[PDB]
Structure formats: C-alpha cells, structure tokens
Structure 1
C-alpha cells in the first residue's frame, strides 16, 4: 500500500464463522507471507519497545504457538534472547505450570524452572490477544520466577473480549484493534 502500519493492517485477513459461527477470525498468515509486511510488523513492535524501555529489556517471552512466529524475530531485532512459554507437556526438565480457560474446557501452560533468573525484565509476545487466557497464565509463571514483566504485546487485540482488563496491572500494547 504505502505506510508500514497500513501494510500490516491490509495483511490481517478476516474469516467470518471460524472456528465457530458468529466469530470473525483475524489471520496473521499474510503478514508472514509478505517479507515487507513481516518486517513492517517487527519494526513497529521493536520501535515501540525500544522507545518505551530504552534498550533495558533482558528477554522476550514467546507464547505457544503463534507467538513463536514473532518472538524470536522481535528478540533478534532488539538484540535479545527469547524464552518459551508452552502448552503443558512440551518442555523437557523441571517446570512450573499454570491453568487457564480454553474454549469449553481448561488447559495448562508451562515454563522451565531455569528459563529465567530472578530480576530479569521480560516482554511477553503473542500474535493476538483474545480472552487473554494464555497471556495471563504466562504472566503468572514469569512472576513465579521473580521476573519483571514490563508488558505484554500483540499485533492484534479483540477488544470485545476484554482480555486487556484481565492483565492489569501488567501494561498491554497492541498494534491493531478489532472487536
């Protein structure tokens, strides 16, 4: 198109009635597919994070699974490492775990007990904030390792689901908002 924000915005594809009737799904797949829009997305998140924390971040925490598509590349742009927060069962060795609500049921996330040392400053990233279930669980786990969660970020936020309120006092930033 032209601007970087509109380049990202034109590449978020809408799918009505997926996964269930009445929902409007936001697919980030086109953002990844277009190298110019992927780099526009990473650069917007990076510039936000650099301006906001002045270089003083220790790690990005990428959220299983779609957050893994952004976390490493964001971290690398910022010159940082990326740690992983995963669905239960996926990581080897001693873990901490936290439950959250998933569709009609309950699920769990986990982090390795040595993923972070105390006092490390971390930004959580995922593609999309919907109910805020996994993101909230992520914050719980990081606090348990005595990490300082600076904020959570996503490319997209679905405001009608009120996942941002669920994260307070943890600050939250999104690039784009839809219902």
Structure 2
C-alpha cells in the first residue's frame, strides 16, 4: 500500500526516550508532510466506513496527541468530534476516571453532555502502548451509556498487549512495532 508507505516513512523512532530501553515513536513528521497526514486520515476513515457503515455517531479524540487526528478524521467521515481530556481542563459537569501511567496515576475526564445514552463512538489516539489510556477513555464513555464501536491509532506496540487490554472492544492500528 503506497498510502501506508507514506505514513510509515514519516514515523521517526528515538531510542532511550524518555528512559533507557524505551523507543519513542514520533508521529510529528506525519503532521509536517501534508501528503502523509492526508494518507493517514484517509486510511483510518476507509477502515472505519468499511467496518461500521453508518453506525458511527461521533469520533472521540484523546488528549493530547489524539487531538491532532480526531477532528480531521471526524471531518472526513462527516461527523463531529468529542473530547476526552486530562482532568481539570473541562468546564461544567464531568465524569473522571483514574488509571496507571508510568510510575504513578493520571486522570481523564469527559463532560457529561458530550454524548447521550445509546450514541456510538470510535476513539482515536496516535499510539496504543499498554492500553491504559484507551481503556480509561472506554470506561468513561461507557458511563455516559455510549457504545464504543472501536478504538483506533496510527501506531500499536504489540509486545505491550494493549489490544488484549481493550477486548472485547475492537482495535485497529495502521502500523505495528514490537
């Protein structure tokens, strides 16, 4: 797939960041090359349309790098984009969920009126690692009685078994690295 190649060629890998042994996957060059960004959004949108048809109501973008892809993906599908944020950033009534991040805890948050019961959503972030962040997003959405059809990312680190963590919610990534 030439389109997938346009994305893969623009992932930059940095060893030992932020800690020794970790390989950081930097999607910045995908954003910087308009053809690469367009290819990434197009591949995600084709997959989602082919898989879910007209069932998707909204895209949910995850703070902060998911924000880079959510609105463009939503626009390509003709849908709105709702936001899941780090706790403390959103006004009005919210729900929040705690999860493990590195050595400590972090918290995600969503406005109670972001979705109504029965609405169907697809969550997007740039990269799936342990799956902790995506799992918390799924939990929050479930508490609004929204149905999470799928989670998607550009990159998946398969050795961390994020896919299994999200089951039985389906997951799809453009690219995979150990």
Scaled to the shorter chain, the TM-score interval is over 0.9
Q: Provide the C-alpha distance between the structure 1 equivalents of 2:147 and 2:102, rounded to a whole number of angstroms.
A: 29
Q: Any stretches of 5+ residues in structure 1 without a counterpart?
A: none
What is the Cα deviation at residue 133 of structure 1?
A: 1.0
Q: Deviations over 1:2-41 (max 9, x none)?
A: 8110010000110001010111111000000000000000
Matched position secondary structure for 2:141: helix
What is the Cα deviation at residue 56 of structure 1?
A: 2.1
Q: Deviations over 1:49-75 (max 9, x none)?
A: 010011321000000000000000000
Q: Provide the C-alpha distance between the structure 2 equivalents of 1:26 and 1:83, rounded to a whole number of angstroms.
A: 25
Partner residue in 1 for 2:114: 115
What is the Cα deviation at residue 161 of structure 1?
A: 1.0
* Misfit runs of 4+, over 6 Å: none
Partner residue in 2 for 1:85: 84
Across the two proteins, how many residue pairs are aligned to each other? Answer: 178
What is the Cα deviation at residue 98 of structure 1?
A: 0.5
Matched position secondary structure for 2:125: strand
What is the Cα deviation at residue 84 of structure 1?
A: 0.3
What is the Cα deviation at residue 134 of structure 1?
A: 1.0
Q: Deviations over 1:121-161 (max 9, x none)?
A: 10000000011111000000111111010000000000111
Q: TM-score, normalised by structure 1?
A: 0.98
What is the Cα deviation at residue 164 of structure 1?
A: 1.0
Q: Provide the C-alpha distance between the structure 1 equivalents of 2:18 and 2:158, rounded to a whole number of angstroms.
A: 18
Partner residue in 1 for 2:51: 52
What is the Cα deviation at residue 90 of structure 1?
A: 0.8
